Amino acid sequence: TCPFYKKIPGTGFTVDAFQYGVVEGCTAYFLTHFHSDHYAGLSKHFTFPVYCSEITGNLLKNKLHVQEQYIHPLPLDTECIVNGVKVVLLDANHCPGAVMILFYLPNGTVILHTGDFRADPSMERSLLADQKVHMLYLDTTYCSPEYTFPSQQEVIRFAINTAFEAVTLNPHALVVCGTYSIGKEKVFLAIADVLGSKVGMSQEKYKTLQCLNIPEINSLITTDMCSSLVHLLPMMQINFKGLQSHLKKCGGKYNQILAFRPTGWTHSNKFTRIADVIPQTKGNISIYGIPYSEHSSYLEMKRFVQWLKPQKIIPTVNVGTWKSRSTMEKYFREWKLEAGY
Q: Which residues are within 8 A (CB) of 41 and not within 5 positions of it... i.e. 6 or more apart?
A: 18, 19, 20
Choose among 197, 176, 156, 157: nearest CA to 285. 176
* 318 contacts 308 by C-beta, under 8 angstroms: no
Domain of 115?
1-147+296-341
* 66 contacts 56 by C-beta, under 8 angstroms: no
153 and 32 belong to one structural domain: no
DSSP-derived 3-state class of residue 46: coil
230 and 241 belong to one structural domain: yes
Overall domain count for the chain: 2
* 253 contacts 173 by C-beta, under 8 angstroms: no
317 and 189 belong to one structural domain: no
* 166 contacts 197 by C-beta, under 8 angstroms: no
Experimental method reported for this structure: X-ray
First-to-last alpha carbon distance for the chain, in angstroms, is 34
290 and 302 belong to one structural domain: no
71 and 155 belong to one structural domain: no
Helix or strand (DSSP H, E) at 81: strand 80-81
96 and 225 belong to one structural domain: no
Cβ neighbours of 293 (radius 10 Å): 24
Residue 221 backbone phi and psi in degrees, to 5: -125, 160
Q: How far apart are CA 137 and CA 134, in angstroms?
A: 10
Report the sign of the C-alpha dihedral through residues 89, 90, 96, 98, in that order: negative
Q: How far apart are CA 313 and CA 137, in angstroms?
A: 6
Label residues 245-281 b or e (16+ Cβ within 10 Å = b): ebbeeeeeebebbbbbbbbebeeebeeeeeeeeeeee
CA distances from 108 to 12, 55, 90, 132 (A): 16, 30, 20, 10
Residues in a beta bridge with 72? 51
Residues in a beta bridge with 289? 261
28 and 102 belong to one structural domain: yes
Q: How far apart are CA 112 and CA 341, in angstroms?
A: 18
* 54 contacts 78 by C-beta, under 8 angstroms: no
Indicate which CATH number applies to the domain containing 194: 3.40.50.12650
Give me the resolution in angstroms, 1 decimal: 1.9
Q: How far apart are CA 299 and CA 216, in angstroms?
A: 35
100 and 218 belong to one structural domain: no
120 and 8 belong to one structural domain: yes
Residues in a beta bridge with 209? none
Largest CA distance in the chain: 68
What secondary structure does DSSP assign to 284-337, as a single string?
SEEEEEEE--SS--HHHHHHHHHHH--SEEEE-SS-SSHHHHHHHHHHHHHHHH
* 291 contacts 149 by C-beta, under 8 angstroms: yes
258 and 325 belong to one structural domain: no
* 140 contacts 328 by C-beta, under 8 angstroms: yes
In degrees, rounded to 5, the angle at the alpha carbon of residue 212 between the alpha carbons of residues 62 and 21 is: 50
Indicate which CATH number applies to the domain containing 99: 3.60.15.10
Q: How far apart are CA 54 and CA 31, in angstroms?
A: 11
Q: How far apart are CA 276 and CA 291, in angstroms?
A: 13
Q: How far apart are CA 117 and CA 33, in angstroms?
A: 10
277 and 326 belong to one structural domain: no
